[PDB]
Design a protein around this ligand. Structure first.
Ligand SMILES: [K+]
Ligand SMILES: [K+]
Ligand SMILES: [K+]
Ligand SMILES: [K+]
Ligand SMILES: [K+]
Ligand SMILES: [K+]
Ligand SMILES: [K+]
Ligand SMILES: [Mg+2]
Ligand SMILES: [Mg+2]
Ligand SMILES: [Mg+2]
Ligand SMILES: [Mg+2]
Ligand SMILES: [Mg+2]
Ligand SMILES: [Mg+2]
Ligand SMILES: [Mg+2]
Ligand SMILES: [Mg+2]
Ligand SMILES: [Mg+2]
Ligand SMILES: [Mg+2]
Ligand SMILES: [Mg+2]
Ligand SMILES: [Mg+2]
Ligand SMILES: [Mg+2]
Ligand SMILES: [Mg+2]
Ligand SMILES: [Mg+2]
Ligand SMILES: [Mg+2]
Ligand SMILES: [Mg+2]
Ligand SMILES: [Mg+2]
Ligand SMILES: [Mg+2]
Lengths: 37, 261, 184, 32, 147
RNA sequence: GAAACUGCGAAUGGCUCAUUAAAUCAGUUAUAGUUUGUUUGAUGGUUACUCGGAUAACCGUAGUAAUUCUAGAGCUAAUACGUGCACCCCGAAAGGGAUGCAUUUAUUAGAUAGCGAUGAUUCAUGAUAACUCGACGGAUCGCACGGCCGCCGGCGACGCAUCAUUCAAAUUUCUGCCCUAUCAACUUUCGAUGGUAGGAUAGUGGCCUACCAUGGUGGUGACGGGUGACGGAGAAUUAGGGUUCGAUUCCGGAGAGGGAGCCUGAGAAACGGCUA
RNA sequence: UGUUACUUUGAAGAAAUUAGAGUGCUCAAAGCAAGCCUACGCUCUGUAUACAUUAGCAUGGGAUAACAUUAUAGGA
């Protein structure tokens, strides 16, 4: 039970981090538009 | 001493317990637990001195040994268990549920809760750091440790903790403009809006809080506890709502009460 | 017993300190280990404050020594204490203390060097050995002592505390410094 | 120690005199 | 060179015999000299970042942190090796007479080779862990007398 | 359910004020300089259908004037005691080595302005090479019985390890103490002040050792002497300022006829513990 | 960014004692209680507040005062 719990919680945390790495890049992409303007 | 002291003389007990000086030579020595001994309310005080369910030290043991009292959702049988700020005390037989909050005079008040609001509590984040295997974790000021916290949570933030799932439901960042309560010192129990943060390298950080009536008071960062984002707290406050009245104003109310009552 | 208190000392002004309490157990000291090089290994277990453990080595013969430039660590036999910066009497008594300069057997490192560089001091195997030989550099002073089978090493552990005698192989200007101290 | 103070005094006395020449030169040019 | 003791003096954790070069790496890595900032708004002297001395009690290149009380005073004695006596002058209030009396206290302090000091110079000292029987402070800044 | 083994406690409390004059102690600091049974929170890898030998109570031969003084014999238990299932390198890409946690050393990463924190740490933490003859990683107990066709499974108790927390300690920063100069120099061979390298310690430190330097304190009273001197919170009297007192119930310290030494333990230099 | 004293405000500060608010232990020294109506109870009942040398911490003030400094400007 505890090995599954540790493995489950570890997977969710990685999904959260990967899910937010897109924002740091997507938000960066739109942020670069100000430099051109 | 050659070790640990197991007794608390009655005159050395915290004043906010409001123990009578001639009631005996000793006061309940708070057990080790989530809260500090000087910033807690042992269950014996709650059951006997505040709620009057027990008349003696012995009767408190009978109540607790029947497993009738729960703190933060778990049954507690220790008479001197240190229940503290934001703790939820539940007594299923009486259908009662209280939250330990300070009144504006700095003393713990058993604020009756609704069944819906008794399913969570607020905790202040102490620190966030990497644990074994590089796994991040955060610990609070109520002794709790939460692994895999949201990366946005930082020290001094407040987290909403669900007592059933035992997980972080939501959190508030510590920043100017939020409503906070003072949990220590002269201004303990006062609620206001965090207006300013004065940092001093190597020294304590001072925070200037402004009451809803414009009264401004300062205190140390360690005595602040964010209650909500913006101006609305996430928890129900007692009648005073953290508004500290002057003695002149308080005497004015007492005089009027006798005229009406 | 041995005590680490300041009560017996003179004040910074020079005046004496009259005793106002007895010695405390929480300020005690203990007898030194005086670890010696000997094949009759002996490490005694000491119960210390908090119920924790210290390992007091009375005699040791082998140690875990690291070749820093090569990033390789091998267990090897301790042969001799040659230099000690604190007390030259610890050299002739062959006492093992932290920062003592000792000679260790070079055989375990020679085997790794031959297995790693294919040099004395299978088609896919020879492919990588020659690849690693491009960036191979060996200090002349460090190579000169491989012929004798002994490497100068410095003890980095505390045998009287951890019960072990670990260290690293001297090289660079540190090797030059100590070999000049031994040149007599 | 003696060399340390000699170099500082020798170099300080050098620029200390160069500045005096430069200020006088600048003053000469400002009059016109 | 700085090697004047019976043992070889070096900074802990700075490996000097690496095949790779230290060009382009932070202090204390790649064999580069290690130094740090002590915070509290104090600057790291150029003599400590570019020096060759070894001092494990130095606040900028050693293994001691500054925390506690920051004090100021005048150099009273600079005759020890890497240690000075700092004289702190203050007024003690005599209550009954509603007046003051001059008092002083001599505070031993460690001074790293990156600092130059003479009797009469003004020094700032920061508290550190016990370095000797009497020393609990480290010099952080020196102002020459008459400056 | 007596007895007995095992576990825990007996380091709190109570008593007293002898020693002690920058010492204790008070306010104020620091631990990035450490240990911490317990509480609370979290966290512990991909013969085994259950091992072994003892011992108490008990039983019965006793010794001694004698003591919770003591010897021998016969039995039998365990959560007692001792055991034991339990990515990188080499390489004809097979195969092999290492591969939990902890321990010890070394190399390496820990940026910038994928990549955490501080006023500030080569910090938290990661990876790698090895190391240790590692009290570690459950041979334990109660209650309830169910669900699948022998299998699976509930709620608890007790225990081991790691981090955080709590309960605390240890050491520690700054300032502050009565009378006395018919006490003016004191400290330093045998540590006095500082430096380097070690040893020891839970850990910092002349705490101790080796070597080196000659420092450290002082009419702003060092050093020494006196106290019918434990310190403080406080007490008496007080227009104000002040004078005197403070053994004693709260806090801190210290001691158990005088010294010293030590075992057990998370915690004692313990005295309703031991050794001289 | 010369360094301080002084002054202002604030934070932190054991309780007990002292001052002091509330309260008819029959009064009082005290104590920390109680009060309200007459129900299966209520007042979220109360258990305020000030003082607290000196030193330390942090804001505002800059008169008075102390120390430091000034011309081969190492000046802006
Ligand atoms: K103690
Ligand atoms: K015990
Ligand atoms: K103190
Ligand atoms: K005192
Ligand atoms: K130490
Ligand atoms: K030393
Ligand atoms: K114990
Ligand atoms: Mg006691
Ligand atoms: Mg700090
Ligand atoms: Mg027993
Ligand atoms: Mg005296
Ligand atoms: Mg002092
Ligand atoms: Mg690290
Ligand atoms: Mg040392
Ligand atoms: Mg010596
Ligand atoms: Mg007295
Ligand atoms: Mg006496
Ligand atoms: Mg007294
Ligand atoms: Mg007496
Ligand atoms: Mg008495
Ligand atoms: Mg007492
Ligand atoms: Mg004692
Ligand atoms: Mg007697
Ligand atoms: Mg004794
Ligand atoms: Mg007795
Ligand atoms: Mg006793």
């Amino acid at each position: 039970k505890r090995i599954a719990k540790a493995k489950s919680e570890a997977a969710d945390y990685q999904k959260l981090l990967a899910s937010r790495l897109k924002e740091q890049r997507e938000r960066r992409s739109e942020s670069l538009a100000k430099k051109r303007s | 001493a050659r070790g640990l002291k197991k007794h608390l003389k009655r005159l050395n007990a915290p004043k906010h317990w409001m123990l009578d000086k001639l009631g005996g030579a000793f006061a309940p020595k708070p057990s080790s637990g989530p809260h500090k001994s000087r910033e807690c309310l042992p269950l014996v005080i709650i059951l006997r001195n505040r709620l009057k369910y027990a008349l003696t030290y012995r009767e408190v043991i009978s109540i607790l040994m029947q497993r009738q009292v729960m703190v933060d959702g778990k049954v507690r049988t220790d008479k001197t268990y240190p229940a503290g700020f934001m703790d939820v005390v539940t007594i299923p037989k009486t259908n009662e549920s209280f939250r330990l909050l300070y009144d504006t005079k700095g003393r713990f008040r058993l604020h009756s809760l609704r069944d819906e609001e008794a399913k969570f509590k607020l905790c202040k984040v102490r620190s966030v750091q990497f644990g074994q295997k590089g796994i991040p974790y955060l610990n609070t000021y109520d002794g709790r440790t939460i692994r895999y916290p949201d990366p946005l949570i930082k020290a001094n933030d407040t987290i909403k903790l669900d007592l059933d799932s035992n997980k972080i439901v939501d959190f508030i960042k510590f920043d100017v403009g939020n409503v906070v309560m003072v949990t220590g010192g002269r201004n303990r129990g006062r609620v206001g809006i965090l207006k300013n943060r004065e940092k001093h390298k190597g020294s304590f950080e001072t925070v200037h809080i402004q009451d809803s009536q414009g009264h401004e008071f300062a205190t140390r960062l360690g005595n602040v506890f964010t209650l909500g984002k913006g101006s609305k707290p996430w928890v129900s406050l007692p009648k005073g709502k953290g508004i500290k009245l002057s003695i002149i104003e308080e005497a004015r109310k007492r005089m009027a009460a006798q005229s009406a009552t | 017993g041995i005590s680490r208190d300041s009560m017996h000392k003179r004040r910074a002004t020079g005046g004496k300190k009259k005793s106002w309490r007895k010695k405390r157990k929480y300020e005690l000291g203990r007898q030194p280990a005086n670890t010696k090089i000997s094949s009759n290994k002996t490490v005694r277990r000491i119960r210390v404050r908090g119920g924790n453990v210290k390992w007091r080595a009375l005699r040791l013969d082998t140690g875990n020594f690291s070749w820093g430039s090569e990033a390789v660590t091998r267990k090897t036999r301790i042969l001799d204490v040659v230099y000690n910066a604190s007390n030259n009497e610890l050299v002739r008594t062959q006492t093992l203390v932290k920062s003592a300069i000792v000679q260790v057997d070079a055989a375990p490192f020679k085997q790794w060097y031959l297995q790693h560089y294919g040099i004395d001091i299978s088609n896919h195997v020879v492919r990588k050995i020659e690849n690693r030989q491009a960036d191979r550099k060996l200090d002349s002073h460090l190579e000169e002592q491989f012929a004798s089978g002994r490497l100068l090493a410095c003890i980095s552990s505390r045998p009287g505390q951890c019960g072990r005698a670990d260290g690293y192989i001297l090289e660079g200007k540190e090797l030059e410094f100590y070999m000049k101290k031994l040149q007599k | 120690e003696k060399a340390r103070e000699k170099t500082l005094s020798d170099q300080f006395e050098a620029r200390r005199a160069k500045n005096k020449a430069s200020r006088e030169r600048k003053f000469a040019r400002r009059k016109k | 060179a700085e090697q004047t003791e019976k043992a070889f003096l070096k900074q802990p954790g700075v490996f000097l015999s690496s095949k790779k070069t230290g060009k382009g790496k932070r202090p204390g890595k790649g064999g580069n000299r290690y130094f740090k900032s002590i915070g509290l708004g104090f600057k790291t002297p150029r003599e400590a970042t570019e020096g060759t001395y070894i001092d494990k009690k130095c606040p900028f290149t050693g293994n001691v942190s500054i925390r506690g009380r920051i004090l100021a005073g005048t150099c009273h004695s600079a005759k020890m090796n890497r240690t000075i006596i700092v004289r702190r002058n203050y007024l003690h209030y005599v209550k009954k007479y509603q007046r003051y009396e001059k008092r002083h206290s001599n505070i031993p302090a460690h001074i790293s080779p990156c600092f130059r000091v003479k009797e009469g110079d003004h020094v700032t000292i920061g508290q550190c862990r016990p370095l000797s029987k009497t020393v609990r402070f480290n010099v952080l800044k020196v102002i020459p007398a008459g400056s």
